[PDB]
Amino acid sequence: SLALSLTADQMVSALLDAEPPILYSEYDPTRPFSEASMMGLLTNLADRELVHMINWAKRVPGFVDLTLHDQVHLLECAWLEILMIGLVWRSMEHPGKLLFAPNLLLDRNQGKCVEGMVEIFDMLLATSSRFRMMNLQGEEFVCLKSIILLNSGVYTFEEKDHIHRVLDKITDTLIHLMAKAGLTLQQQHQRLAQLLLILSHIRHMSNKGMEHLYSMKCKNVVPLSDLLLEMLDAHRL
Amino acid sequence: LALSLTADQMVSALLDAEPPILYSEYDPTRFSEASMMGLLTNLADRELVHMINWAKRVPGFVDLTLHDQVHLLECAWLEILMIGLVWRSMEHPGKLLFAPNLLLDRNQGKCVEGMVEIFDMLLATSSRFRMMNLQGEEFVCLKSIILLNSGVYTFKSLEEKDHIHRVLDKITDTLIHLMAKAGLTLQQQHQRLAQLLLILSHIRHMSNKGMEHLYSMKCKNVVPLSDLLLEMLDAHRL
Amino acid sequence: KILHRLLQE
Amino acid sequence: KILHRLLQE
Ligand SMILES: O=C(c1ccc(O)cc1O)c1ccc(O)cc1O
Ligand SMILES: O=C(c1ccc(O)cc1O)c1ccc(O)cc1O
Hints:
The complex is a heterotetramer, with 2 copies of chain A and 2 copies of chain C. Chain A is built from 9 helices and 2 strands, in the order αααββαααααα. By secondary structure, chain A is mainly alpha-helical. Chain A has a two-stranded antiparallel ribbon with strand order 1-2.
């Protein structure tokens, strides 16, 4: 694979270039929020981000080397995690708020408008606070997001070794980034650990988020697009 | 205290704190859904009591308020049970060693509704452990990391949050120590550290699914759960 | 499967 | 809670 032949700097350049854009919601401020309309903004937003995600994933070194069935499985497993980390990233500079879109910045009080949602907002806000605490860098962020894509479904499987080789390359990349940043050898491994342990929390929020979306579906709160329905069905809740 | 320990001292403390491997009450001459589930929940309840005593021996844990200790244990308890199970089953490809007299292969998970999916994830993790040749010293580090990490984000007591992060760094230092001592290069130490920590993501996933499964068994009244077990289950408010 | 098709476009 | 009691024992 040519992905295994990339240098650290080339890796970061590829990932940075593949970044999807920040999208807008169709928030209509002429009418008051209801549970239904807030959740509708979120489900509409998620569907649009998904399309850009699908195309972002294809630009992640090593991903297109996999069979369509493997690509499908990885994205099925990680999609909400990837949406969430992007959200937390976007919200870093807005303490107490979640920047779903530039025209949709919500605080926890607004989150209470949807049943079971505030719990998820709270976890998302705590993670954003953690990013701030660590001063997470953009280059580190894109590495983390790619790790989630390749790792989350990897153990639901020679293609395994290829995935782990790419993952090792990204580890190399993170270290290289920390070193160039002037972190000592000890700080390098300590930060690497701090960053990867965040992924455990991101998985957790995803699992809860999946159950939450499922509940919205089974209560007919909002209609989900066919795509969103299939991504959800894949977690068979 | 904990922050004063050396890498070798941390390893020793963690190894000495290890809980015992329990036996099942299982009568091997008799398996129904209610049968198998009762055995698992009975085992889980007993392992939990030992886990609580073990947590107290993890360096840094008793420095936290009672409230914070409860929170961490409530969040991580099934992760901790599961990684222990995976570790015990490591040398038994295709089987889950719940106890020395309770070694269940993949197909026996089918005796319980929705259990086989969980079995498959646990087995895949054990295989990953084998593939990496996970060591006992690394295992106990990982298990301590889960205790301190899983509920740490969901915490004027940020000095307690920062203290926990300092202890977490120490455990990271300890993992690296073990790897350098094993003769791994610098590049290999960082790669292996990452590989180990990424496993914790899968373990969190399995815990979440396991918690929903246990809950679905609770509302089927097929198996009676101990008071302690119901309290741990209810802390996840599903 | 929609995703399967979207991954080809 | 049982846990709180066990942590104090
Ligand atoms: O976090 C969510 C989310 C939604 C849309 C989006 O573009 C990004 C998101 O992280 C989210 C989606 C559905 C749900 O039920 C709960 C969520 O937190
Ligand atoms: O993983 C489980 C488990 C049970 C008992 C035990 O001693 C260890 C375990 O990991 C487990 C328990 C209950 C349940 O519904 C699902 C599980 O995976």
